[PDB]
């Protein structure tokens, strides 16, 4: 498919930025996670970035580390995440769905098999947190064979060489953590990540030239704060996402 391409074209046709929220699949539970996700979408999320709980997320802060703890406490496994992914895609045919993975869960039962599974459930992209562009060959090749866009992070300490690689190897969107150079090398639309927790940062991202913004932990923080009340959790998630999406317009 070309869900990202269709999304960005539609967003551009109305000078709008994309707002992409991140959540951990199965946090704090399978049932509640599915509801959280449906809420994020009803509230205006343009695409989703979903994490699959991993034992050692060496590339995540406390918010995410705790999110995995909650998920594992709920017995969430990669197999269950994929069952969830299938359900989510069956309810929402057009919203781009990107996974944030750790190399081992991808490599475990074979890289090709992982991306084949992604295509089967309808996933659109995959960002492997601990695979630099230097080690990405087998991953992006497998992704492309299965119509999965391989996503790469463009770090702050990046250089021109990394920029050329990321532009050449990525698809769907570039995970920005510069914008002119990326556009210059025809890189996938850039989404601003890291620190997106208020509407002004969304507007600032779009104004900077980015195609949108990703809220890497703010969503998870709202979940963390409303664990005691599932109903208040969804309500606050709706208000937050609604506010963040309006800022992209």
């Amino acid at each position: 498919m070309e869900r990202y391409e269709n999304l960005f074209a539609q967003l551009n046709d109305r000078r709008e930025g994309a707002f992409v929220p991140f959540v951990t699949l199965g946090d704090p539970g399978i049932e509640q996670s599915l509801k959280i996700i449906d809420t994020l979408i009803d509230a205006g999320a343009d695409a989703l970035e979903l994490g699959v709980p991993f034992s050692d997320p060496l590339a995540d802060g406390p918010t995410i580390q705790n999110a995995n703890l909650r998920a594992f406490a709920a017995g969430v496994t990669p197999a269950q995440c994929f069952e969830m992914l299938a359900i989510i895609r069956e309810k929402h045919p057009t919203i781009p769905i990107g996974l944030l993975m750790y190399a081992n869960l991808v490599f475990n039962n074979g890289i090709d098999a992982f991306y084949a599974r992604c295509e089967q459930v309808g996933v659109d992209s995959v960002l492997v947190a601990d695979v630099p562009v230097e080690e990405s060959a087998p991953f992006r090749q497998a992704a492309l064979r299965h119509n999965i866009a391989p996503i790469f992070i463009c770090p702050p300490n990046a250089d021109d060489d990394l920029l050329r690689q990321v532009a050449s190897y990525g698809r769907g969107y570039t995970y920005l953590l510069l914008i002119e150079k990326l556009k210059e090398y025809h890189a996938a639309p850039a989404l601003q990540g890291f620190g997106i927790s208020s509407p002004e940062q969304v507007s600032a991202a779009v104004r900077a030239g980015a195609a949108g913004a990703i809220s890497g932990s703010a969503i998870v923080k709202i979940i963390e704060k409303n664990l005691a009340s599932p109903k208040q959790m969804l309500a606050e998630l709706r208000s937050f996402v609604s506010a963040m999406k309006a800022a992209s317009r």
Binding site: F54, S55, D56, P57, L58, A59, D60, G61, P62, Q65, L69, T77, P78, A79, A103, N104, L105, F107, N108, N109, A129, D130, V131, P132, V133, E134, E135, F152, I153, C154, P155, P156, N157, A158, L162, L177
Partner: protein, 391 residues
């Protein structure tokens, strides 16, 4: 783009977030530079000699092999400053940090030996040291925790995940991701992302170089085999390195068998794990069928690294090195045997290496063989553990 090959066959690599690659390239570049710098070599040799106590002895153990045709020598890293081989490479890495104009050190530790080694090297070379240690390990290693603080290091408990070494490993990398400009991550074993497996081996290779020179001096020939325990792989690759091109010399790595391979309660990923990608490298790992990383179990807390250095997995693949395992009970017997017959208290880690040597001897007492066991560390720290088990 790298200056050295990051892989040993299919194992190794640099599986870290993009933000950490510059730190690794910078580190690789500094190491290559340092290795060809005679002033760096002389300074490192000076610390090793006049501060750490190198060269270490090569002790012949006659009582233990009486009645057999086995001649056994123990490379005495237990006599190194700090009580273990860990000290060799932290001194080298500390010097590398300074060469890079770094003023702070980040280190990870399970049993605490590496934490203590990083702390003493940092104290000596004027480096601000912060150590990450799994809360579960902090609780069970109070002595080593106090030693670290006594030496001025800042000890930080890790409650995330299983609160053990692997969780300390992630937390260190996280910290380094955003501080590598002024801080150097002093990895504790011959594993992790390139250039660490290469760097640690090179900074531990004097173990084998000394052993070769000493054995030639005393026996006039090379060992039939050199044996070392394998937690992460540093003391073993340290001993093995200089002998790799000596095809007649067997290289035997000993992983902890714990309560027994068949019980699943062990720490032998190289021979009983499954290849995975974690801690910045592709290597054999202790993991679930699903791909989640598990802990390694052993009576010895120092053999807790849930994976193994990529160079060992490679040496095993091509058949240059052989890896076996030794259970808690076999290691306990070797520990008591050394204390009683040679008056040396070995670290429970080292005892695994010794136990396999004892097995080679006992199983074929009429086989003429010249063996060297790398006594990676002293076991004063294990006196309590062994105490409880006995009687």
């Amino acid at each position: 783009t790298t200056l050295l090959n990051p892989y040993f066959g299919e194992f190794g690599g640099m599986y870290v977030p993009q933000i950490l690659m510059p730190a690794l390239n910078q580190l690789e570049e500094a190491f290559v530079s340092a290795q060809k710098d005679p002033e760096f070599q002389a300074q490192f040799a000076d610390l090793l000699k006049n501060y750490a106590g190198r060269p270490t002895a090569l002790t012949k153990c006659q009582n233990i092999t009486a009645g057999t045709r086995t001649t056994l020598y123990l490379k005495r890293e237990d006599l190194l400053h700090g009580g273990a081989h860990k000290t060799n490479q932290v001194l080298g890495q500390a010097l590398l940090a300074k060469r890079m104009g770094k003023s702070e050190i980040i280190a990870e530790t399970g049993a605490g030996q590496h934490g203590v080694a990083s702390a003493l090297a940092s104290a000596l070379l004027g480096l601000k040291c912060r150590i990450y240690m799994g809360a579960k390990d902090v609780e069970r290693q109070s002595p080593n925790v106090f030693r670290m603080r006594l030496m001025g290091a800042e000890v930080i408990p890790v409650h995330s995940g299983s609160a053990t070494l692997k969780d300390a490993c992630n937390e260190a990398l996280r910290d380094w991701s955003g501080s590598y400009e002024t801080a150097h991550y002093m990895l504790g074993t011959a594993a992790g992302p390139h250039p660490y497996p290469t760097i640690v081996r090179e900074f531990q290779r004097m173990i084998g170089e000394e052993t070769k020179a000493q054995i030639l001096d005393k026996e006039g020939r090379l060992p039939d085999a050199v044996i070392a325990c394998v937690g992460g792989g540093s003391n073993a690759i340290g001993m093995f390195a200089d002998f790799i091109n000596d095809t007649s010399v067997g290289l035997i790595g000993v992983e902890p068998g714990g309560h027994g391979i068949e019980t699943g309660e062990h720490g032998a990923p190289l021979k009983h794990g499954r290849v995975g990608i974690y801690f910045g490298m592709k290597a054999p790992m202790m993991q679930t069928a699903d791909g989640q990383i598990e802990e390694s179990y052993s009576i010895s807390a120092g053999l807790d690294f849930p994976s193994v250095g990529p160079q060992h997995a490679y040496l095993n693949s091509i058949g240059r090195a052989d890896y076996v395992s030794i259970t808690d009970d076999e290691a306990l017997e070797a520990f008591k045997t050394l204390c009683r017959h040679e008056g040396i208290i070995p670290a429970l880690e080292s005892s695994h290496a010794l136990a396999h040597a004892l097995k080679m001897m006992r199983e074929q007492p009429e086989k003429e063989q010249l063996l060297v066991v790398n006594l990676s560390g002293r076991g004063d720290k294990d006196i309590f553990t062994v105490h409880d088990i006995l009687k």
